[PDB]
């Protein structure tokens, strides 16, 4: 192949007295005529290279034929109807259907009909206590602004004019009287307020509940009324970290607000109440969270009592049918325990395997609960759970064109350089031979307290069908083992994340799953940095590298507005000489060196992106093309139907990967 010429400039930056050259500084401007022309030239070379792969079209057709299929959500009762979401596989928005006792299901609310291009999406859905009126908000695609519409459920017609100027709001009813919502604007800046809208009145008359006086000023406020209509819980926060919480007893007239938590030093949220007892989920004095109870009449932190004490695993709580479900992440997969409201453990719920769950949410009187389950080998499946007996039955199998029994997903654990034990989930078609020849993709992220929990993806399923192995490592920096796991992958410990990933690659080879020339590494954003770091430190470790939307220039990433929010995880080159030396020591852009033979690489990024600027990918690819000395191609694919786009991208990635591994024909018949 022949790369486009990339002009080199003379920009030199200085950090604590050390000079650093940046010859591709001009590529930081993704909107200049010069950069846009370079983008066009790079895509031309990339497409021309991919066009020589004989089976690229076969891969694309295979993905295209398995990409769209019908979906259905769990049913929920409101009034005399059971409601459930469905998607025929083609419509952009899920449709809400309903069905009553002895009649066929019917469409109730189809969001696709509200927008010409079907971008208007339903956000919040909240029925009145009796199920007769529906309050729902719509997001006109991308905008944070909202309107709360009120619909008469029986006639499906509007009850009254929609509420306007709603933002970052929930919708919570007080019986059938009206509901609480949040807005920055007085109904008649940055001070979010809770209002109560009474049905049958004009919005301009909505009563202010919280947020207007100086002592209540907060950037984000929320309000929830308990299912039994006894308590109103108002949350107030200025950031995603910590919130104050107040409670009002609605069983009394003009009750004052009592303070459940008066500082922002911890997160605390309502689970439910039973009588005058509040059940709260919190991380106060409990990083992995705990479930506490306290009387609503004297609810402060000093009075909270543990119902479900903090454990070594992170806790999430669901409630339904008169039970509490404590969900724990154990080695990146879900476990669920059922408790009564008195704190007695009823049983451990027997899940279908190791994966990710959703559900176990219901009303106090729901006769059954539903939960979803999926993992890398199993498409999302719905199950029915009988609360008292604990019996579980399949409710809805997935319509995805993949048979679960055809795939295997196993959890292994390996050791990193420093001895740390790290989880690794490996998936593939049943009947894989550990002869080290399997085409393998190793995926990781490693940062920002992000936990990589199993999730099903058509793209991955197709890779497995092509004979591939897909491995995901739960590297440090993530939140799989809580705060300490995250911290061990930040700032001057970031190298730990890369060491964890290198050790996973070494493990996949040693255990016989693959070998160097049959291994690809992949990751996106912070995961793109991961791929960039590992391929510049160990270019001999893998045959293919796939860094997507990566943060690759670690010395200047913070000078872009979105990067100013990742300081906790990365630190910046303006922090201190030590932090500067550390970043320069691993910064992918600054560690590509002339003379080195890099693996075949396909850098991916959108042409314009304000979250992770294309500058990182552009400069990184330019440097790889200038410095690489071996026979492997260093390509960049710049993305400029969105489903067609996604199918096209997966086809290019898989065709490139197998082709670079030397496959003349696909490993398995298409």
CA of residue 270 relative to chain centroid, distance: 23
Domain boundaries, given as residue ranges, for the chain: 1-69+400-670, 70-399
Compute the distance between CA of residue 612 and CA of residue 605 in angstroms, rounded to an integer: 9
Compute the distance between CA of residue 274 and CA of residue 412 in angstroms, rounded to an integer: 42
Nearest to 522 by CA among 587, 408, 602, 625: 602
Question: Which residues lie closer than 8 Å to 485 by C-beta, 6 or more apart?
Answer: 476, 477, 478, 479
Contact predicate 615/669, CB 8 Å: no
CA of residue 3 relative to chain centroid, distance: 36
Burial class (CB in 10 A: 0-12, 13-18, 19+), 434: exposed
Compute the distance between CA of residue 472 and CA of residue 443 in angstroms, rounded to an integer: 5
Instruction: Report angle CA 131, 137, 141 to the nearest 5 degrees.
Output: 145
Compute the distance between CA of residue 122 and CA of residue 110 in angstroms, rounded to an integer: 9
Q: Report strand pairing: 268-274 vs 193-198.
A: unpaired
**What secondary structure letter does DSSP report for 516?**
G
Instruction: Report angle CA 320, 324, 330 to the nearest 5 degrees.
Output: 120
Which own/partner contact pairs does 359-363 have at CB distance under 8 Å and 24+ positions apart? 359/74, 359/318, 360/318, 360/320, 360/325, 360/327, 360/336, 360/385, 361/318, 361/319, 361/320, 362/76, 362/319, 362/320, 362/321, 363/77, 363/227, 363/320, 363/321
Copy the structure tokens of residue 580: 């500067």
Nearest to 15 by CA among 593, 497, 587, 627: 587
Terminal-to-terminal C-alpha distance of the chain? 28
**What secondary structure letter does DSSP report for 539?**
T
What is the architecture of the domain spanning 1-69+400-670?
Answer: 3-Layer(aba) Sandwich (3.40)
3-state secondary structure string across 420-454: CEEEEEEEEECCCCCCCCCCEEEECCCCCCCCCCC
Nearest to 146 by CA among 135, 157, 133: 135
Nearest to 202 by CA among 164, 175, 166, 229: 164
Contact predicate 508/439, CB 8 Å: no
Residue the block writes with tokens 């009850």: 159
Contact predicate 162/156, CB 8 Å: no
Q: How many CA atoms lie within 13 A of 112 on its CB side?
A: 15
Biggest alpha carbon distance in the chain? Answer: 79
Beta strands in 204-276, from DSSP E residues, in sequence order:
207-210, 220-225, 231-237, 244-249, 258-261, 268-274
Contact predicate 321/310, CB 8 Å: no
Compute the distance between CA of residue 521 and CA of residue 538 in angstroms, rounded to an integer: 12
Q: What are φ and ψ of residue 638, in 5° steps?
A: -105, 115
Technique used to solve these coordinates? X-ray
Nearest to 334 by CA among 300, 357, 350, 316: 357
Beta strands in 1-45, from DSSP E residues, in sequence order:
12-15, 18-21
Compute the distance between CA of residue 475 and CA of residue 498 in angstroms, rounded to an integer: 8
**Alpha helix (H) ranges present in 562-641?**
567-570, 577-586, 588-591, 615-627
**What secondary structure letter does DSSP report for 191?**
-
Q: What are φ and ψ of residue 415, in 5° steps?
A: -110, 135
3-state secondary structure string across 307-323: EECCCCCCEEEEEECCE
Q: Report strand pairing: 145-152 vs 323-330.
A: unpaired
Q: Give resolution, Å, one decimal.
A: 1.8
User: What residues form DSSP beta bridges with 196?
Assistant: 180, 207
Chain breaks in the chain (C to N over 2.5 A) after: 188, 640
Cβ count near 117 (within 10 Å): 8
**What secondary structure letter does DSSP report for 74?**
P
Q: Is 327 helix (H, G, I), strand (E, B) or coil?
A: strand
User: What residues form DSSP beta bridges with 429?
Assistant: 407
Contact predicate 437/514, CB 8 Å: yes
Question: Which residues lie closer than 8 Å to 576 by C-beta, 6 or more apart?
Answer: 16
CATH superfamily of 70-399: Prolyl oligopeptidase, N-terminal domain (2.130.10.120)
**Alpha helix (H) ranges present in 144-251?**
none
Q: What are φ and ψ of residue 60, in 5° steps?
A: -60, -45
Element (H, E) at 34: helix 33-50
Which own/partner contact pairs does 61-67 have at CB distance under 8 Å and 24+ positions apart? 61/670, 62/462, 62/465, 62/466, 62/670, 63/458, 63/459, 63/462, 63/647, 63/650, 63/651, 63/654, 64/647, 65/401, 66/400, 66/401, 66/402, 66/458, 66/461, 66/462, 67/458, 67/643, 67/647
Contact predicate 505/541, CB 8 Å: yes
Q: Is 533 helix (H, G, I), strand (E, B) or coil?
A: helix
Question: Would the CA dihedral through 614, 617, 619, 625 be positive or negative?
Answer: negative
Instruction: Report angle CA 83, 88, 93 to the nearest 5 degrees.
Output: 70
Contact predicate 69/401, CB 8 Å: yes
**What secondary structure letter does DSSP report for 406?**
G
Alpha-carbon distances of 602 from 4, 154, 523, 550, 635, rounded to whole Å: 15, 55, 12, 12, 5
Contact predicate 269/281, CB 8 Å: yes
């Amino acid at each position: 192949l022949h790369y486009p010429v990339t002009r080199q400039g003379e920009q030199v930056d200085h950090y604590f007295g050390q000079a650093v050259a940046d010859p591709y500084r001009w590529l930081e401007d993704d909107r200049s005529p010069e950069t846009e022309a370079w983008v066009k030239a790079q895509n031309a070379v990339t497409q021309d290279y991919l066009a020589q792969i004989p089976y690229r079209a076969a891969i694309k057709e295979k993905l295209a034929a398995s990409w769209n299929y019908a979906k259905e959500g769990a049913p929920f009762r409101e009034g005399r109807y059971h409601y459930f979401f469905k998607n025929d596989g083609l419509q952009n928005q899920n449709v809400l259907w309903r069905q009553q006792e002895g009649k066929p299901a019917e469409v109730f609310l189809d969001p696709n009909t509200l927008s010409p291009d079907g971008t208007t999406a339903l956000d919040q859905l909240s029925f009145s206590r009796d199920g007769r009126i529906l309050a729902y908000s719509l997001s006109l695609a991308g905008s944070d602004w909202r309107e709360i519409h009120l619909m008469d459920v029986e006639s499906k017609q509007p009850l009254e004019t929609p509420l306007k100027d709603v933002k970052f709001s929930g919708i919570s009813w007080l019986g059938n009287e009206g509901f609480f919502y949040s807005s920055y604007d007085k109904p008649d800046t940055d001070q979010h307020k809770v209002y109560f809208h009474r049905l049958g009145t004009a919005q301009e008359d909505d009563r202010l509940v919280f947020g207007a006086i100086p002592a209540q000023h907060h950037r984000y406020v929320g309000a929830t009324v308990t299912e039994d209509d006894r308590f109103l819980l108002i949350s107030a926060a200025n950031s995603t970290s910590g919130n104050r919480l107040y409670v009002k007893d609605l069983s009394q007239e003009n009750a004052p607000l009592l303070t459940v938590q008066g500082d922002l030093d911890a997160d605390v949220s309502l689970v439910d109440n039973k009588g005058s007892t509040l059940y709260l989920l919190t991380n106060r004095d409990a990083p992995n969270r705990r479930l506490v109870t306290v009387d609503a009449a004297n609810p402060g932190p000093a009075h909270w009592r543990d119902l479900i004490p903090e454990r070594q695993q992170v806790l999430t709580v669901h409630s339904g049918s008169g039970y509490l479900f404590a969900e724990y992440m154990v080695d990146a997969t879900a476990r669920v325990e059922q408790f009564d409201y008195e704190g007695k453990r009823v049983r451990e719920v027997a899940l279908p395997g190791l994966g990710s769950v959703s559900g176990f949410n219901g009303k106090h009187d729901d006769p059954a609960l539903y939960f979803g389950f999926e993992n890398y080998a199993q498409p999302p499946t719905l199950y029915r759970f009988e609360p008292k007996s604990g019996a579980i039955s399949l409710y809805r199998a997935s319509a995805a064109p993949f048979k679960p029994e055809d795939y295997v997903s196993e959890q292994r654990f390996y050791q990193s350089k420093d001895g740390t034990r790290v989880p690794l989930i490996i998936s593939y078609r049943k009947g894989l031979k550990l002869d080290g020849s399997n085409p393998t993709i190793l995926y990781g992220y490693g940062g920002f307290d992000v936990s990589l929990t199993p999730s099903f993806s058509v793209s991955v399923a197709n890779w497995l069908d092509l004979g591939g192995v897909y491995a995901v490592a739960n590297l440090r920096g993530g939140g799989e083992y809580g705060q300490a796991w995250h911290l061990a992958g930040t700032q001057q410990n970031k190298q730990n994340v890369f060491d964890d990933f290198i050790a996973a690659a070494e493990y996949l080879k040693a255990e016989g799953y693959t070998r160097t020339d049959r291994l690809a590494i992949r990751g996106g954003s912070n995961g793109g940095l991961l791929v960039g770091a590992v391929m510049t430190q160990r270019p001999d470790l893998m045959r293919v590298a796939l860094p997507a939307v990566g943060v690759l220039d670690m010395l200047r990433y913070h000078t872009f507005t979105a990067g100013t929010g990742w300081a906790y995880d990365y630190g910046t080159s303006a922090d201190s000489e030590a932090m500067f030396d550390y970043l320069k020591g691993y910064s992918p852009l600054h560690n590509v060196r002339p003379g080195v033979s890099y693996p075949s690489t396909m850098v991916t990024t959108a042409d314009h992106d304000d979250r992770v600027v294309p500058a990182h990918s552009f400069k990184f690819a330019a440097t790889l093309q200038a410095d690489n000395a071996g026979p492997h191609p260093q390509l960049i694919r710049i993305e400029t139907t969105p489903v067609a786009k996604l199918i096209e991208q997966s086809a290019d990635i898989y065709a490139f990967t197998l082709y670079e591994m030397g496959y003349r024909e696909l490993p398995r018949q298409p």
